[PDB]
Amino acid sequence: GSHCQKTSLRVNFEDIGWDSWIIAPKEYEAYECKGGCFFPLADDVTPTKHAIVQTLVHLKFPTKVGKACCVPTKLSPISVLYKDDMGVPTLKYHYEGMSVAECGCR
Amino acid sequence: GSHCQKTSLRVNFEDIGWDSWIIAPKEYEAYECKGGCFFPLADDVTPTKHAIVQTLVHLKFPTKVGKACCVPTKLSPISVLYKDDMGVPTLKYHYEGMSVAECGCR
Numbered sequence: 001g002s003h004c005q006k007t008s009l010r011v012n013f014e015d016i017g018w019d020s021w022i023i024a025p026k027e028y029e030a031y032e033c034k035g036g037c038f039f040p041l042a043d044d045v046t047p048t049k050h051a052i053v054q055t056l057v058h059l060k061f062p063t064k065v066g067k068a069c070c071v072p073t074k075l076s077p078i079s080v081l082y083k084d085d086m087g088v089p090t091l092k093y094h095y096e097g098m099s100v101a102e103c104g105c106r
Numbered sequence: 107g108s109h110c111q112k113t114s115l116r117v118n119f120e121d122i123g124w125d126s127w128i129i130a131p132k133e134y135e136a137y138e139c140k141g142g143c144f145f146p147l148a149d150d151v152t153p154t155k156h157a158i159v160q161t162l163v164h165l166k167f168p169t170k171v172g173k174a175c176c177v178p179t180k181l182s183p184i185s186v187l188y189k190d191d192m193g194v195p196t197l198k199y200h201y202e203g204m205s206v207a208e209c210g211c212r
């Protein structure tokens with residue numbers, strides 16, 4: 001059963017070019033939503049009626065319409081130590097939208 | 107600029123096998139979110155920080171991590187005339203989550 005779930009994704013801030021303004025941490029766990037949104041669906045997929053309808057339409061017209069996507073439905077914040085406009089290391093205690101909390105078909 | 111926007115998708119309830127319980131309408135406009143989530147991004151894409159971070163990581167490791175997805179971020183309801191458990195045509199005035207209102211990279 002390769003369905004929509006949260007899997008591991010470690011993100012190094014230097015690789016994405018954010019080390020120019022983020023001092024710490026060097027890496028953090030962002031996770032990622034991976035998996036198919038096809039039927040039969042599952043309980044924790046938590047689909048919208050539109051993703052269900054869209055998946056059905058994709059099944060009958062695969063070349064015209066795409067299928068639903070496994071995306072983050074809830075995000076959690078992290079804390080980062082960034083450079084202030086005057087070079088002062090300032091802590092952003094709740095940097096929102098950085099880590100995946102829940103996944104779902106949308 | 108092939109970016110994340112709302113495009114047309116007409117859904118026939120008979121094709122998706124929902125005509126067994128939905129009397130009317132035969133078809134309705136559900137729309138769909140289509141388009142790339144790559145950079146440079148746009149204003150109405152309205153990305154989360156995780157979709158931005160994920161797209162960056164995808165750019166540097168295309169085979170390990172997938173990119174962000176263009177998905178519905180807000181849904182609108184429709185009205186359907188369905189069969190009651192005793193065969194009575196009943197109107198569901200607000201059948202939620204059926205039509206796309208806004209799109210975005212998630």
Ligand SMILES: [Cl-]
Pocket residue numbers: 001039040
């Ligand atoms: Cl299965």
Ligand SMILES: [Cl-]
Pocket residue numbers: 039040041042
């Ligand atoms: Cl199902």
Ligand SMILES: [Cl-]
Pocket residue numbers: 047048049050202203204
């Ligand atoms: Cl829904």
Ligand SMILES: [Cl-]
Pocket residue numbers: 046047048049
């Ligand atoms: Cl939902």
Ligand SMILES: [Cl-]
Pocket residue numbers: 062
């Ligand atoms: Cl297919």
Ligand SMILES: [Cl-]
Pocket residue numbers: 062063064065066
């Ligand atoms: Cl397509």
Ligand SMILES: [Cl-]
Pocket residue numbers: 072073074075154
């Ligand atoms: Cl979100």
Ligand SMILES: [Cl-]
Pocket residue numbers: none
């Ligand atoms: Cl706290």
Ligand SMILES: [Cl-]
Pocket residue numbers: 092093094095
């Ligand atoms: Cl904060």
Ligand SMILES: [Cl-]
Pocket residue numbers: 094095096
């Ligand atoms: Cl923030």
Ligand SMILES: [Cl-]
Pocket residue numbers: 107145146
């Ligand atoms: Cl462009």
Ligand SMILES: [Cl-]
Pocket residue numbers: 145146147148
């Ligand atoms: Cl951008």
Ligand SMILES: [Cl-]
Pocket residue numbers: 096097098153154155156
């Ligand atoms: Cl965000």
Ligand SMILES: [Cl-]
Pocket residue numbers: 152153154155
């Ligand atoms: Cl947002």
Ligand SMILES: [Cl-]
Pocket residue numbers: 168
């Ligand atoms: Cl690519």
Ligand SMILES: [Cl-]
Pocket residue numbers: 168169170171172
């Ligand atoms: Cl992949």
